[PDB]
Design an enzyme around this catalytic site. Structure first.
Site, PDB file in Angstrom:
ATOM      1  N   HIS A 242       0.816  -1.249   0.000  1.00  0.00           N
ATOM      2  CA  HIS A 242       0.000   0.000   0.000  1.00  0.00           C
ATOM      3  C   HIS A 242       0.848   1.297   0.000  1.00  0.00           C
ATOM      4  CE1 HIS A 242       0.022  -0.519   4.533  1.00  0.00           C
ATOM      5  NE2 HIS A 242       0.183   0.803   4.451  1.00  0.00           N
TER       6      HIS A 242
ATOM      7  N   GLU B 164       0.838  -8.382   0.683  1.00  0.00           N
ATOM      8  CA  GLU B 164       1.026  -6.994   1.205  1.00  0.00           C
ATOM      9  C   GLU B 164       2.508  -6.663   1.384  1.00  0.00           C
ATOM     10  OE1 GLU B 164      -1.293  -5.015   0.879  1.00  0.00           O
ATOM     11  OE2 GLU B 164      -0.363  -3.230   1.821  1.00  0.00           O
TER      12      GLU B 164
ATOM     13  N   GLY C  59       1.239   5.698  11.024  1.00  0.00           N
ATOM     14  CA  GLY C  59       2.659   6.038  11.228  1.00  0.00           C
ATOM     15  C   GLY C  59       3.525   4.806  11.497  1.00  0.00           C
TER      16      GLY C  59
ATOM     17  N   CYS D  15       3.254   1.785   9.862  1.00  0.00           N
ATOM     18  CA  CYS D  15       3.295   0.827   8.726  1.00  0.00           C
ATOM     19  C   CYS D  15       4.738   0.728   8.254  1.00  0.00           C
ATOM     20  CB  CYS D  15       2.293   1.142   7.616  1.00  0.00           C
ATOM     21  SG  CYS D  15       0.598   0.743   8.145  1.00  0.00           S
TER      22      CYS D  15
END
Ligand SMILES: C[C@H]1CCCN(S(C)(=O)=O)[C@@H]1CO
Length: 182
Positions: free
Chosen positions: A41, A72, A146, A148
Site C-alpha cells: 500500500h 502486502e 505512522g 506501517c
C-alpha cells in the site's frame, strides 16, 4: 530494556531507512545487497526518497501467494551506493506463532520507537482495507497510523512488517527466507 529490545535495536540501527512515497513516510527494512521491503500500500513508483535522497527504483515486485492472493509485501531493489548488512539468516523458513515480539518504527514522526506487542498469532486470512490478504500475523496492541513498515522481531528472528490495525489489534505480513533467495 532487555534482550528483545537489544535484538530489535540491532536491526533498526543497521537495516532500516526512512522511505517516502506519494502515500507517506514508511519504516523500510533492508534485507541484503540493495534489496528492501515495504508494505504494498506504499505504492512504490520509479523514484522513491530514501533518508530524503532521490533514489531510482531498479525493480519492485508486489508479492502474491500461489492462490494469487495479496501478501502486502513489496520487494524493492534500490539504486543506492551502499549495501545492507545481510540479515537473511534471521528470517523464519515457515509460517509460525511467536512469543514476546517487539514492533520497531523509525520515521520523522516516530524516531527510535519500540513497542513490546507480546504474543503473535499466525492469523492467516485478513480482509485488509477491503483486500483479501494471506500470511497475516496478529498482536494485541492498538497500533496507529505512522507504524506501517515497522519491523516485528523476536530474539534472533525478523518475522514480519506491520501493515495495518483495527484500533485494538495490529497486523503484520510474514517475512519468509524463501522470498529473498538469489
Ligand atoms: C526529485 C523528484 C523526482 C520525481 C518526483 N518529484 S516531485 C516534485 O516530488 O513530484 C521529486 C521532487 O523532489
Amino acid at each position: 530494556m532487555g534482550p528483545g529490545f537489544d535484538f530489535a535495536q540491532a536491526i533498526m540501527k543497521k537495516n532500516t531507512v526512512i522511505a517516502r512515497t506519494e502515500k507517506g513516510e514508511f519504516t523500510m527494512l533492508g534485507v541484503y545487497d540493495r534489496v528492501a521491503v515495504i508494505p504494498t500500500h506504499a505504492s512504490v513508483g520509479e523514484i522513491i526518497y530514501i533518508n530524503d535522497v532521490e533514489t531510482r527504483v531498479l525493480d519492485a515486485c508486489a508479492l502474491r501467494d500461489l492462490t494469487d492472493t495479496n501478501l502486502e509485501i513489496t520487494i524493492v531493489k534500490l539504486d543506492r551506493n551502499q549495501k545492507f548488512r545481510d540479515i537473511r539468516h534471521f528470517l523464519p523458513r515457515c509460517e509460525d506463532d511467536y512469543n514476546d515480539a517487539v514492533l520497531s518504527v523509525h520515521t520523522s514522526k516516530f524516531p527510535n520507537m519500540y513497542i513490546p506487542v507480546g504474543q503473535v498469532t499466525n492469523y492467516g486470512f485478513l480482509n485488509l482495507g477491503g483486500t483479501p490478504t494471506h500470511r497475516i500475523l496478529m498482536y494485541n496492541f492498538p497500533t496507529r497510523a505512522g507504524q506501517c513498515g515497522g519491523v516485528v522481531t523476536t530474539t534472533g528472528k525478523v518475522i514480519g512488517i506491520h501493515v495495518g490495525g483495527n484500533g485494538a489489534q495490529g497486523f503484520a505480513a510474514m517475512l519468509l527466507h524463501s522470498y529473498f533467495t538469489d
